[PDB]
């Protein structure tokens, strides 16, 4: 159509390069709402499809279940639009104003969840957290601007070592950090007060897909009865109900002897969830999902 | 003969089985003065025993020690007999009327086992007042071996697990633990301690006053605030009555809370105790085995008014005063002991090398 699959995939990876802060998810809503201003169509059911191709073309292109989640939930976006005004002249503009004010909130998501979250850092505290994540360094940034002074320890995160960028990112701040083995999160979990860690998706029952070593961590945590803290934005709820580790969708584990790249959380071992919808319990990530389809 | 202590008040109905008596009330209102079917010293040591002028379980067995040595000075064979049994037979009215006075503590049945063993060994043939010396020796040697080598041993072994800058939480009063404190503090660990004291003995505020004479920095609460200084709390330091065949430990009512209250904020339990105070016997609860103390000790003046005066009067309404309570072996990390650093399940061991 107006847009190919070759300049959808470099519009996407182009968006994602010139801003690296903006997550996968972010970039990905905006080439679909880019590919919605573009598409010279008429009837809302081929829209509907050529956006559910796009959306498994930019899954194809990235394995990350944040794209999926903000797929789906342009999905939803398209299918209430539709609903609100029934000729398709008029659902375009309204789609595209929407999609515009939806892009500016899910850009003020992250400081919303660091203003809401700094709070819980406590002075001379020890965070421990698992790998990079935006999110975190953003909260931990506005922890360190309230004249805070805590300590955080990091891991490496094996299999590409971005335990090691979070801690160079945590030291361009002047935050006391260190590097421990993944091995060591239990060895090291007494020492720390609280944990919080990022989330690539939200399932529906309050449970989080996060990276390869997080389970071991919340276990952890939960053996010593540590709180564990998941900063995690909206557009990553999923309705996804996993019932154990093998559970979790192929797409996710690969491609992004045997080496899984994300693992499931369960609802019972976090304690809150920080999101731009405020301070939740796991229990409330299922009533959300309830709410938006009907 | 020796009457029987009248039960006090109305006890609650899953506590029916155990005696409960009043402070008030004695017994040796209804005996002959001079006391002649009781020793006069068993007498007396009675008599302190149920006022209560004499408390910790290490005082209570060296009183009841004394009290022996003193009733086997004064003891006499009569003719056409033999020390062994006269003397057994002749002490076993002693610690019913004692018993009676006050139930016996677990380091008091271990002396009496001790003793009446040391008894039952004197020979036939030997002299009377040559038995009388060497059984003397033998209570001053048990003494001292059981109380004050045993406490100096387990002092050196918990000056090892002491660090500088740490936070210990001690609950009640123990001689074992303020002592490891006052030599921990001597010996040139700098540390603060965390009292923690119940209602109505408050028998945590001796402890307190120790440390205070002895430059050791010191904080004072109750019970219920427990959890609110556990975060700060680096270990708990805790002293036993009693530890029994199954590992689990037999102490002042409070101590299986503060137990689980620490396991529940990730701090160490460690519970320091001599070898004699170890007990054969196993208790799974504390409803078994258990000492009702005089209910009126709960009545307090908050205001102008006390609200549990004349209790009696309300049908329904009962006083509960436990004494002792039990811990689970899985709520305690370590065992102080005299000949080392050894874990709950290790208590039977120990039981099976001091026996033989």
Redesign the interface.
């Given at each position: 159509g107006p847009m190919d699959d070759k300049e959808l995939i470099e519009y996407f990876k182009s968006q994602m390069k010139e801003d690296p802060d903006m997550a996968s998810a972010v970039a990905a809503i905006r080439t679909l709402l880019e590919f919605l201003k573009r598409d010279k169509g008429e009837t809302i059911q081929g829209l509907r499809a050529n956006l559910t191709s796009a959306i498994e073309t930019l899954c194809g292109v990235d394995s990350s279940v944040a794209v999926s989640s903000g797929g789906e939930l342009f999905l939803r976006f398209i299918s209430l639009a539709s609903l609100e005004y029934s000729d398709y002249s008029k659902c375009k503009k309204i789609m595209i104003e929407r999609g515009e004010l939806f892009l500016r909130r899910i850009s003020l998501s992250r400081n919303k969840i660091a203003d809401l979250c700094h709070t819980f850092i406590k002075d001379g505290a020890t965070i421990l957290t698992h790998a990079y994540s935006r999110v975190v360094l953003r909260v931990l940034e506005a922890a360190v601007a309230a004249k805070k002074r805590f300590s955080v320890y990091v891991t490496e995160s094996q299999p590409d070592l971005s335990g090691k960028k979070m801690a160079k990112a945590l030291c361009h701040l002047n935050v006391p950090v260190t590097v421990v083995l993944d091995a060591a999160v239990g060895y090291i979990m007494?020492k720390a007060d609280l944990v919080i860690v990022g989330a690539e998706g939200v399932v529906e029952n309050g449970g989080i897909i996060n990276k390869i070593g997080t389970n071991q961590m919340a276990v952890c945590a939960k053996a010593?009865?540590?709180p564990f803290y998941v900063v995690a934005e909206s557009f990553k709820f999923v309705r996804l109900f996993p019932l154990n580790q093998q559970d979790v969708p192929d797409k996710f584990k690969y491609k992004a002897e045997e080496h899984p790249w994300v693992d499931y959380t369960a609802p019972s071992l976090i304690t809150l969830l920080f999101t731009d919808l405020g301070v939740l319990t796991p229990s409330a990530v299922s009533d959300e999902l309830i709410k938006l389809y009907l | 003969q020796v009457p029987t202590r009248k039960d006090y008040g109305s006890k609650v109905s899953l506590f029916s089985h155990l005696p409960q008596y009043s402070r008030q009330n004695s017994l040796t209102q209804f005996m002959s003065i001079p006391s002649s079917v009781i020793h006069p010293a068993m007498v007396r040591l009675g008599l302190q025993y149920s006022q209560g002028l004499v408390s910790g379980s290490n005082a209570r067995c060296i009183a009841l020690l004394r009290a022996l040595q003193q009733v086997i000075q004064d003891y006499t064979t009569p003719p056409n007999e033999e020390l062994s049994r006269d003397l057994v037979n002749k002490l076993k009215p002693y610690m019913s009327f004692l018993t009676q006075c006050r139930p016996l503590s677990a380091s008091m049945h271990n002396a009496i086992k001790f003793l009446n063993k040391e008894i039952t060994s004197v020979g036939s043939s030997k002299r009377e007042e040559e038995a009388k010396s060497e059984l003397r020796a033998a209570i001053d040697r048990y003494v001292q071996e059981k109380i004050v080598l045993a406490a100096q041993a387990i002092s050196r072994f918990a000056y090892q697990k002491i660090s500088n800058g740490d936070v210990i939480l001690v609950y009640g009063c123990s001689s074992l633990v303020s002592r490891i404190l006052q030599e921990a503090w001597t010996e040139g660990r700098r540390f603060r301690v965390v009292v923690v004291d119940s209602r109505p003995w408050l028998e945590g505020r001796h402890t307190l006053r120790s440390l205070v004479h002895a430059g050791v920095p010191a904080s004072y609460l109750l019970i219920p605030a427990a959890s609110y200084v556990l975060p700060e709390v680096s270990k708990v330091l805790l002293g036993a009555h009693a530890l029994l065949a199954n590992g689990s430990v037999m102490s002042r009512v409070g101590t299986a809370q503060l137990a689980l209250v620490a396991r529940?904020?990730?701090v160490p339990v460690l519970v320091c105790c001599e070898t004699y105070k170890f007990c054969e016997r196993v208790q799974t609860d504390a409803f078994v085995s258990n000492e009702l103390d005089d209910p009126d000790d709960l009545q307090c003046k908050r205001g102008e008014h006390v609200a549990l005066a004349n209790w009696q009067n309300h049908a329904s309404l009962r006083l509960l005063n436990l004494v002792y309570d039990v811990t689970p072996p899985e709520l305690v990390d370590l065992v102080i002991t005299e000949l080392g650093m050894i874990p709950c399940s290790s208590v039977p061991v120990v039981l099976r090398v001091k026996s033989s």
């Open positions: 007494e010593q009865n540590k | 529940a904020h990730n």
